[PDB]
């Protein structure tokens, strides 16, 4: 003969007063089971007493932590006050339905007049609670804000990550996708380079005929204006662009003097320098990401950054998918990711495998084991030079 | 569903009072015909599975205006026998099924509470407030209305029960904390009007716990100062004003709200020769707050709002008003 029951939920927690509660003899029966199943026969069973939502994600999260321990927070206790009639059981007591044995015992400790009943014992309140979680969305819709799917979703993510310390040592997604970006933008830099190269050489081909380093080509076209307004060392530009006094600027001037190409329209030159400025900005962003990946690779996998170098080590980890994947890979798998060269290849595969498992399984990584193994590969290079 | 038979029950409930109204000359055959037809259509759409508390309120106001019109026609017809009790009870049944159906419409909750508070169902209103407050533990509006009608009736202990439970539950917004300090000091003013309570340490204590409350904001403490500054005609009002000022001066030293309360502090019970002297003292405080190193735009917005309020207070000197205009324009 039960009166109330609590219920724990990802959106909150509630209590319900059962009116015309369930048979205790009649529990294996088909008809009682189908009556439990159908909502249309269960709302007459259970009435809502009261409901309590979470305030914040950390609040419900700590609630999960507490209830997994078995201990409770004072605000659920406040709900117990807020819905329980005050007494001790000197003449009368009150029956509460609780799932977990620790939880029920602690509530009975906290309140003398309550017999809490853990479902682990009680098939009765277990069956009640299973009807609860059966219709747990359709006894709430009028008062439930939003939904429960996304709630369970985010809450479980956070609980998993709290118990496992997830974000404090997962970074390889940023690592490998930064690598993917750098390769993509680098090839795009190459395409922009060749395109604006031939594209300006239509107006002036001596710039190709003398000038390599297409980023410097882009700098000198954004600084060049047109073919006629040239001087060597005008203001703050060619001195740090290149050699300025005696080597390059005079040759550029005499190339523009011997120049032969088509004179360009002004809005076309504006287009040209828009393109070149784009090229320079993305090359600058490449160097920013290069420094950034060196820093992040130093932060997350120092041993690999010293044994291979950051670009190639990051190539390998991106082709792997994750540092955990790299650790999972065996040695010949690392080969897949004369005879002396293949022998060295196997050897370095072994060593980077070990450095990988080290970096994947240190909490805050170090550098020194990568350093000593770098010395091992250095003396192995010496050993194979001795031949 | 089973709406035909459930509505059969409810219309059979509605029958005998209408029989009384037909043996009376108060309503004729066609009128009562129209009435029963309307009530049937109403109760049907009420007990429809797909349902909404707006249409619930529609039926609510419909039966309420029925009781009203029948009372008016009865008074015009000088009849005394017929009462309103069955109409009240069927209105209550409409509400009861409404609240069992939707546990989620706070507006309909307040509608039920207003109807009860108007028709004098005292203990019933208390118990319904109890239920709905258990149902929605996250509306300071509900908590404040509970404790406020309790403070209005005079059960200050039950007012303290409702308000203290609300403070125990709601902890994200300081609004019910504001209103609780409001009703506590209002009860203290009621004591001083009927003239521990001589100390009046309860707003001090609720500020002490508010100091470590989760919503602990400097602007929240400023609003605490504002509600304390309301009704400054008391005994320990200077005491609590000094206490909150020294508390926020100890905690938020360079806050523009701390400078605003340092400006508007000695105007507790002002409205008379004591007005312009304290005005000049607070103006010296205001000039000091202006020259001090704080967020000058924030402090100036605070002071221009409070000075627009001051301009809304009439009965002042034109020189004072114009120098407020100048000090307002110079921000």
């Amino acid at each position: 003969v039960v009166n109330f029951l609590l219920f724990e939920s990802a959106v909150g927690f509630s209590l319900f007063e059962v009116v015309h509660q369930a048979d205790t003899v009649g529990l294996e029966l088909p008809e009682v089971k189908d009556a439990m199943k159908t909502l249309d026969k269960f709302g007459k069973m259970v009435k809502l007493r009261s409901f309590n939502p979470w305030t914040s994600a950390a609040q419900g999260l700590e609630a999960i932590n507490l209830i997994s321990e078995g201990i409770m927070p004072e605000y659920l206790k406040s709900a117990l006050e807020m819905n329980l009639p005050q007494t001790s059981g000197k003449k009368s007591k009150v029956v509460l339905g609780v799932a977990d044995k620790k939880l029920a015992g602690e509530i009975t400790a906290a309140f003398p007049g309550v017999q809490c009943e853990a479902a682990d014992t009680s098939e009765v309140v277990a069956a009640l609670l299973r009807g609860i979680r059966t219709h747990a969305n359709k006894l709430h819709k009028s008062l439930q804000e939003g939904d429960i799917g996304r709630a369970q979703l985010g809450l479980g993510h956070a609980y998993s990550r709290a118990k496992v310390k997830f974000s404090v040592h997962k970074n390889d997604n940023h690592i490998i996708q930064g690598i993917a970006t750098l390769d993509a933008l680098d090839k795009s830099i190459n395409q922009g380079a060749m395109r604006v190269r031939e594209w300006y050489g239509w107006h002036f081909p001596e710039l190709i005929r003398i000038v390599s380093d297409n980023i410097t080509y882009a700098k000198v076209v954004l600084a060049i204006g047109n073919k006629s307004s040239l001087t060597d060392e005008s203001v703050d530009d060619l001195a740090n662009v290149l050699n300025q006094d005696q080597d390059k600027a005079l040759a550029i001037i005499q190339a523009a003097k011997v120049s032969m190409g088509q004179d360009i329209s002004e809005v076309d030159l504006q287009m040209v320098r828009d393109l070149a400025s784009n090229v320079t900005s993305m090359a600058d962003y490449r160097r920013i990401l290069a420094e950034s990946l060196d820093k992040k690779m130093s932060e997350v996998a120092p041993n690999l950054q010293v044994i291979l170098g950051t670009p190639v080590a990051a190539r390998l980890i991106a082709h792997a998918g994750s540092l955990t994947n790299l650790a999972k890979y065996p040695a010949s798998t690392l080969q897949i990711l004369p005879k002396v060269k293949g022998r060295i290849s196997r050897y370095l595969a072994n060593k980077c495998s070990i450095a990988s498992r080290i970096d994947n399984f240190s909490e805050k990584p170090t550098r020194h084991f990568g350093e000593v193994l770098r010395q091992q590969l250095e003396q192995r290079l010496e050993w194979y030079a001795k031949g | 569903a089973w709406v035909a038979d459930k509505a059969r029950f409810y219309l059979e409930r509605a029958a005998p009072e209408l029989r009384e109204w037909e043996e009376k000359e108060i309503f004729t055959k066609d009128e009562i015909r129209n009435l029963v037809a309307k009530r049937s259509d109403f109760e049907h759409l009420v007990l429809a599975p797909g349902t909404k508390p707006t249409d619930f309120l529609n039926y609510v106001n419909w039966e309420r205006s029925l009781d009203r019109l029948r009372a008016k026609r009865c008074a015009r017809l000088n009849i005394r026998s017929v009462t309103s009790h069955a109409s009240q009870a069927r209105t209550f049944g409409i509400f009861e099924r409404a609240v069992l159906k939707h546990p989620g419409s706070i507006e309909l909750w307040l509608a039920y509470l207003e109807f009860a508070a108007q028709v004098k169902a005292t203990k019933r209103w208390r118990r319904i407030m109890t239920r709905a407050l258990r149902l929605h533990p996250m509306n300071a509006s509900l908590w404040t209305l509970a404790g406020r009608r309790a403070a209005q009736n005079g059960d200050m202990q039950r007012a303290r029960a409702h308000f203290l439970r609300g403070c125990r539950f709601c902890t994200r917004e300081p609004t019910l904390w504001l209103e609780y300090a409001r009703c506590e000091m209002d009860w203290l003013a009621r004591m001083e009007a009927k003239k521990p309570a001589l100390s009046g340490a309860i707003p001090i204590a609720v500020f002490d716990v508010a100091r470590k409350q989760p919503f602990w904001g400097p602007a929240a403490a400023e609003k605490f100062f504002d509600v304390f500054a309301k009704f400054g005609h008391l005994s320990c009002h200077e005491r609590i004003i000094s206490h909150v000022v020294t508390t926020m001066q100890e905690l938020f030293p360079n806050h523009p709200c701390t400078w605003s309360v340092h400006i508007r502090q000695p105007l507790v019970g002002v409205d008379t020769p004591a007005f312009p002297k304290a005005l000049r003292e607070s103006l010296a405080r205001l000039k000091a707050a202006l020259q001090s190193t704080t967020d000058r735009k924030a402090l100036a917005t605070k002071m221009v709002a409070w000075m627009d309020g001051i301009l809304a207070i009439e009965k002042l000197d034109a020189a004072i008003r114009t120098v407020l205009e100048h000090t307002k324009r110079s921000l």
Partner: peptide, 28 residues
């Protein structure tokens, strides 16, 4: 009776705030 809210006492004292106000009212 779970139909109403009977007023609070040190048995159903919840927090430090309730403890302080109940101390004040017991002093009263």
């Amino acid at each position: 009776d779970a139909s109403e809210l009977q007023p609070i006492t040190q048995k159903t004292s919840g927090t430090e705030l309730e403890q302080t106000i109940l101390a004040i009212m017991e002093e009263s």
